[PDB]
Amino acid sequence: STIEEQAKTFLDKFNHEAEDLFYQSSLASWNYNTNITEENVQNMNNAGDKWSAFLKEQSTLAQMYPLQEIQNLTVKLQLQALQQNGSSVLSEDKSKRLNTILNTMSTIYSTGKVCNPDNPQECLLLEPGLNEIMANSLDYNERLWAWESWRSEVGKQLRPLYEEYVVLKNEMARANHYEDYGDYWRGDYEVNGVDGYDYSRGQLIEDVEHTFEEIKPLYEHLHAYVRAKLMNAYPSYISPIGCLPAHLLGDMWGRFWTNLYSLTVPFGQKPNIDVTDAMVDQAWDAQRIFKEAEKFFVSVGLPNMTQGFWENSMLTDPGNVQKAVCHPTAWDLGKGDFRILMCTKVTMDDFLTAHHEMGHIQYDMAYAAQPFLLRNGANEGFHEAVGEIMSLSAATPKHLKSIGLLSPDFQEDNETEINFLLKQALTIVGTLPFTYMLEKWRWMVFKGEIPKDQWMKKWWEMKREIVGVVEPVPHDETYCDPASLFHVSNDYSFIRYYTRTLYQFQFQEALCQAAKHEGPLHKCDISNSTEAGQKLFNMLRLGKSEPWTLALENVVGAKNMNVRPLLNYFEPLFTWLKDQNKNSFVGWSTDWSPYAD
Amino acid sequence: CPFHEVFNATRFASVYAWNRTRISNCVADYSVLYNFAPFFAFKCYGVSPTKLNDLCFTNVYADSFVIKGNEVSQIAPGQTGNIADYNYKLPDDFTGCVIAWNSNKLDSKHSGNYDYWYRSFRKSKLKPFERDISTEIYQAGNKPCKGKGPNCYFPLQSYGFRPTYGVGHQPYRVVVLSFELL
């Protein structure tokens, strides 16, 4: 006869067809993202629709092979990825109903106008202006406006769409033998079937609470310092014992506090590291800022970049004629073709982001040997974590001294060493409470834990207790403040950022141990340490073939995600924020409210 | 003594239906192969690359086909795969050479070179120097069939060569040679 595991032969047939069709879909997606034309976008949509139909039919075929009779630790994972059968088990005008709901939420988020009472015709979307307003205005009025009015003319109309989205995704997940759509999202972290490595779906919730608990003080001290440095830019608008107004956090939602850097500077007279003014006297072109990134990756052992990467990736900017999406994107087209779509203007940020995208591409080359369905990060937050650890290793002032950007006489005073580390802690920390709170709210809402007539309540309760951010005006249930964020009104799991932060700092700590680093973690670059090359590549070679806990053990050494490397990263500046807040009341009171005055 | 040609044969056979051409007694001046192209792989197992000219044999075959770069190594004594298990098996006592060179343009198209086929599925592994031109549907399962759609599958599989692919994915022309003595 024939073993039920014959799915092997089925997966061998699927993989060749998947590799060829995905390459066509990605190549069509590539030449559009660099060369937008009507014919290019039509080709991209045609290839994507063909690829999606191919996945649908292969999932229907893979329905025939039960995972119960499969035991190979890799064939079962590919069969699971195929016959996951998500959004196709849902009824015809249900997944489609949601489909239109998803499209409507996407278009309301992308195309949504907000404008002042005085000039009702000068209206701006959160992308143009509104964004800037939150990053530049640094006002309390101009910032309280464009915040409430973003939640009112956009969040209120996103509310019914999200209320139907939650329920429709609920039956979509329950028909997939889940309990809610939060469980469907956590199913990427499911690991069962592996002796020892048995990460369940609810264990993700368990460990995010048990890591946010250790994240609390670092945050509470950072939040207290930011509050103390926001009572001299908004002197009569923030209580020294209360939370932070949500419109004073550098952006629309308070996700990242990186735009509060100018206000909250440890030492404003000491300039931060920025080699943009240094690598224009070296006349670096677009290629070289990548040529010395590849060097970095061949410093640690990661192989060279393929000849089909310099001759096929648009690293010299769109070119002022064709239209080209400029998001720094590493692209794994298919059969051995790795490119980066990145519009590189000479700038330190572009240098670090080039290192980021090359880390992404190196990871793609590493797990290219795996079967197609196992060609991805072992979970949500490994690929991005690799990218950011490459960025961190590139951004260290010691790395920019073998490279002739900084003169061979520089020495960051603890001053800029706290300046840079707080600049990083406004991005890293400040989004961990935001990410954890938002995804925890979504997780409860999906299981209905949060009654609809209480959604906003719980939202703005959590913001007061978890993030320590008070709403500037009371939001009744007509609002959908979470949906005002991109990842909420676009069906994107958001815990990937929290897990990715934990993973990236574990990766950095482990690679610095492998590199025999001696000083602080933030001063550590992995460069020239081939032993830290064959310590992450042992995980990079593993895609979804092995459980993400096993991959973490391979690279870090711990079975489950840990926050201690993140805290060890910020132990300096943790001592400094403990010293600075000796007078400031560390923490916040959830009772405080701007309107409560 | 055909070597100025067997190698530069357009439309090389595909690997499942590899083309064998016999080399009779002639001038035997195949030392000129070193001056054709920068071969990706030139592996002489039973004979030495420096001993090609002086050593003499009786009969020679020029087995030619096209594979990927991740599959050139599979053309070796042993070294299991799909190119060795089901398409082109080399005997463990192989005495000839292995000559593979890239042809990512000579044999690639931007829309797809769905012309070079390799057999991914087969009942038994190929014996050394065996050809399996037969293209009857594979069972890949146990309910005997009549057409594809169930576990039954088409034995052959295209390559999908792009004018652009990873080196190990790029097309590679391999005019292997077969020495034998009577």
Partner-chain contact B164 A308, CB within 8 Å:
yes
CB A563 within 8 A of CB A211: yes
Nearest of A58, A65, A152, A56 to residue A113 by alpha carbon: A152
Query: Using a CB-CB distance cutoff of 8 angstroms, which residues of chain A are in contact with residue B153?
Result: 9-10, 13
Choosing from A223, A355, A475, A487, the catalytic residue is A487
Radius of gyration for the alpha carbons in chain B, expressed in angstroms and rounded: 17
Q: Which residues contact B146 (CB under 8 A, 6 or more apart)?
A: none
CB B83 within 8 A of CB B174: no
Parallel, antiparallel or unpaired: strands A244-245 and A469-470: parallel
What is the dihedral sign for C-alpha B39, B45, B47, B49? positive
Q: Enter the tokens of residue A467.
A: 């993030």
Partner-chain contact A10 B140, CB within 8 Å:
yes
Partner-chain contact B112 A20, CB within 8 Å:
yes
For residue A258, the 8-state DSSP code is G
How far apart CA A539 and CA A375 sit, in angstroms, is 13
Task: Give burial (CB, 10 Å; 0-12/13-18/19+) of A246.
Answer: buried
Q: Please give the annotated binding residues of A for chloride, written as ranges.
A: 151, 459, 463
A64 in contact with chain B, both atoms CB, cutoff 8 A: yes
Amino acid at A572: P
Search chain B and give the residue with CA nearest A368. Answer: B166
Residue with tokens 């072109």: A285
Q: Under DSSP, is residue A344 helix (H, G, I), strand (E, B) or coil? A: coil
Residue B20 sits in a domain whose CATH number is: 3.30.70.1840
Helix axes A348-366, A533-540, angle to 10 degrees: 60
Q: Under DSSP, is residue A114 helix (H, G, I), strand (E, B) or coil? A: strand
Nearest of A323, A405, A308 to residue A44 by alpha carbon: A323
Amino acid at A480: C
Region of A148 please: left (phi>0), alpha (psi -120 to 50) or beta. Answer: alpha
How far apart CA A364 and CA A383 sit, in angstroms, is 9
Nearest of B52, B28, B24, B33 to residue B175 by alpha carbon: B33
Q: Which of B140, B157, B169 sits opposite A336 (nearest CB)?
A: B169
What is the dihedral sign for C-alpha A553, A555, A561, A563? positive
User: In degrees, to the nearest 5, what angle opens at C-alpha B165 toward C-alphas B161 and B169?
Assistant: 70
For residue A343, the 8-state DSSP code is -
Q: Please give the annotated binding residues of A for Zn(2+), written as ranges.
A: 356, 360, 384
Q: Which helix (H) or strand (E) holds A463?
A: none
CB A447 within 8 A of CB A180: yes
Q: Enter the tokens of residue A454.
A: 């209480």
Q: Which of A19, A334, A336 sits opposite B168 (nearest CB)?
A: A336
Amino acid at B104: N
B-interface mutation test, from A10, A13, A25, most B Cβ less than 10 A away:
A13
How many residue contacts between A and B have a Cβ separation below 8 Å?
A: 63
How far apart CA A245 and CA A471 sit, in angstroms, is 6
In angstroms, the separation between the Cα of residue A227 and the nearest Cα of chain B is: 53
Partner-chain contact A6 B165, CB within 8 Å:
no
In angstroms, the separation between the Cα of residue A548 and the nearest Cα of chain B is: 27
What is the dihedral sign for C-alpha A60, A64, A65, A68? positive
In angstroms, the separation between the Cα of residue A20 and the nearest Cα of chain B is: 7
Partner-chain contact A2 B153, CB within 8 Å:
no
What is the dihedral sign for C-alpha A571, A588, A479, A166? positive
Partner-chain contact B120 A12, CB within 8 Å:
yes
Nearest of A304, A327, A306 to residue A317 by alpha carbon: A327
Q: Which helix (H) or strand (E) holds A574?
A: helix A574-580
- If one counts every other C-beta atom within 10 angstroms of the C-beta of residue A149, the result is 17
What is the dihedral sign for C-alpha A205, A208, A214, A220? negative
Q: Enter the tokens of residue A431.
A: 């989004």
Query: Using a CB-CB distance cutoff of 8 angstroms, which residues of chain A are in contact with residue B162?
Result: 23, 27, 335, 337
In angstroms, the separation between the Cα of residue B56 and the nearest Cα of chain A is: 40
Q: Which residues pair with B35 in a beta bridge?
A: none
For residue A217, the 8-state DSSP code is H
A15 in contact with chain B, both atoms CB, cutoff 8 A: no
Amino acid at A591: D
Q: What b/e string do you get for B29-66 counting C-beta neighbours within 10 Å, with b at 16 or more?
A: ebeebeeeeebbbeebeeeeeeebeeeebeebbbbbbb
Distances (CA, A) of B166 to A338, A357, A364, A511: 8, 19, 13, 29
How far apart CA B132 and CA B117 sit, in angstroms, is 12
The range of the structural domain enclosing residue B11 comes to 1-182
Question: What one-character-per-residue DSSP string does chain B give?
Answer: ---SSGGG-SSPPPSTT-EEEEE-SS---GGGGGGT---SEEEESSS-TTSTTT---SEEEEEEEEE-GGGSTTSSBS--SSIIIII-PBPTT--SEEEEEE-TTTT--SS-BTT-EEE---SSPPPTT------PPB-SSSS--SSSSSS-B-SEEE--B-SS--GGGS-EEEEEEEEE--
Search chain B and give the residue with CA nearest A369. Answer: B70
Parallel, antiparallel or unpaired: strands B172-180 and B97-102: antiparallel
Q: Under DSSP, is residue A497 helix (H, G, I), strand (E, B) or coil? A: helix
How far apart CA A298 and CA A306 sit, in angstroms, is 12
Q: Which residues contact A17 (CB under 8 A, 6 or more apart)?
A: A54, A58
Q: Which of A10, A24, A337 sits opposite B165 (nearest CB)?
A: A337
CB A13 within 8 A of CB B122: no
How far apart CA A56 and CA A185 sit, in angstroms, is 20
A304 in contact with chain B, both atoms CB, cutoff 8 A: no
Provide φ and ψ at A281, rounded to 5°: -85, -15
How far apart CA B20 and CA B6 sit, in angstroms, is 10
Search chain A and give the residue with CA nearest B82. Answer: A12
Q: Under DSSP, is residue A101 helix (H, G, I), strand (E, B) or coil? A: helix
Q: How many domains does chain B have?
A: 1
Q: Under DSSP, is residue A348 helix (H, G, I), strand (E, B) or coil? A: helix
Q: Enter the tokens of residue A577.
A: 């924020």
Q: Under DSSP, is residue A339 helix (H, G, I), strand (E, B) or coil? A: strand
Nearest of A369, A172, A187 to residue B168 by alpha carbon: A369
Partner-chain contact B151 A335, CB within 8 Å:
no
How far apart CA A446 and CA A438 sit, in angstroms, is 12
Q: Which residues contact A399 (CB under 8 A, 6 or more apart)?
A: A296, A393, A525, A527
Region of B98 please: left (phi>0), alpha (psi -120 to 50) or beta. Answer: beta
Nearest of A41, A244, A252, A50 to residue A134 by alpha carbon: A252
A479 in contact with chain B, both atoms CB, cutoff 8 A: no
Q: Please give the annotated binding residues of A for substrate, written as ranges.
A: 255, 327-328, 497
Q: Under DSSP, is residue A123 helix (H, G, I), strand (E, B) or coil? A: strand
Q: Which residues contact A204 (CB under 8 A, 6 or more apart)?
A: A186, A189, A495, A499
Q: What b/e string do you get for A60-99 counting C-beta neighbours within 10 Å, with b at 16 or more?
A: ebbeebebeebeeebbbbbbbbbbebbbebbeeebbeebe
Find the farthest-apart pair of alpha carbons in chain B and give their distance in angstroms, rounded: 57
What is the dihedral sign for C-alpha A499, A500, A505, A507? positive
Partner-chain contact A6 B168, CB within 8 Å:
no
Q: Enter the tokens of residue A526.
A: 């992995």
Nearest of A230, A207, A131, A202 to residue A430 by alpha carbon: A230
- If one counts every other C-beta atom within 10 angstroms of the C-beta of residue A124, the result is 17
In angstroms, the separation between the Cα of residue B35 and the nearest Cα of chain A is: 24
Provide φ and ψ at A298, rounded to 5°: -90, -5
Find the farthest-apart pair of alpha carbons in chain A and give their distance in angstroms, rounded: 81
Search chain B and give the residue with CA nearest A309. Answer: B166
Report the Cα–Cα distance between both ends of chain A, in Å, rounded.
79
Partner-chain contact B167 A20, CB within 8 Å:
no
CB A33 within 8 A of CB A339: no
Strands annotated E in A446-547:
469-470
Provide φ and ψ at A376, rounded to 5°: -165, 175
Choosing from A357, A380, A412, A509, the catalytic residue is A357
B-interface mutation test, from A9, A17, A306, A372, most B Cβ less than 10 A away:
A9
Identify whether A487 is a catalytic site residue: yes
How far apart CA A177 and CA A174 sit, in angstroms, is 5
Region of A370 please: left (phi>0), alpha (psi -120 to 50) or beta. Answer: beta
Q: Which of A6, A307, A336 sits opposite B140 (nearest CB)?
A: A6
N residues, chain A:
597
Q: Which residues contact A38 (CB under 8 A, 6 or more apart)?
A: none
Identify whether A357 is a catalytic site residue: yes
Query: Using a CB-CB distance cutoff of 8 angstroms, which residues of chain A are in contact with residue B142?
Result: 1-2, 6
How far apart CA A562 and CA A508 sit, in angstroms, is 12
Partner-chain contact B160 A64, CB within 8 Å:
no
Parallel, antiparallel or unpaired: strands B172-180 and B156-158: unpaired
Q: Enter the tokens of residue A175.
A: 């028909």
CA dihedral (B77, B81, B82, B87) in degrees, to 10, reads 10
According to the 3-state scheme, what is the secondary structure of A17-67? HHHHHHHHHHHHHHHHHHCECHHHHHHHHHHHHHHHHHHHHHHHHHCCCCH
CB A460 within 8 A of CB A151: no
How far apart CA A329 and CA A356 sit, in angstroms, is 9
Q: Which helix (H) or strand (E) holds A162?
A: helix A156-174
Question: What one-character-per-residue DSSP string does A311-330 give?
Answer: TTS--S---SSSB---S-EE
CB B177 within 8 A of CB B97: yes
Q: Enter the tokens of residue B176.
A: 């292997």
Q: Which residues pair with B61 in a beta bridge?
A: B22, B178
CB B33 within 8 A of CB B3: yes
A56 in contact with chain B, both atoms CB, cutoff 8 A: no
Partner-chain contact A16 B167, CB within 8 Å:
no
How far apart CA A207 and CA A205 sit, in angstroms, is 6
CA dihedral (A456, A462, A468, A470) in degrees, to 10, reads 20
How far apart CA A251 and CA A132 sit, in angstroms, is 8
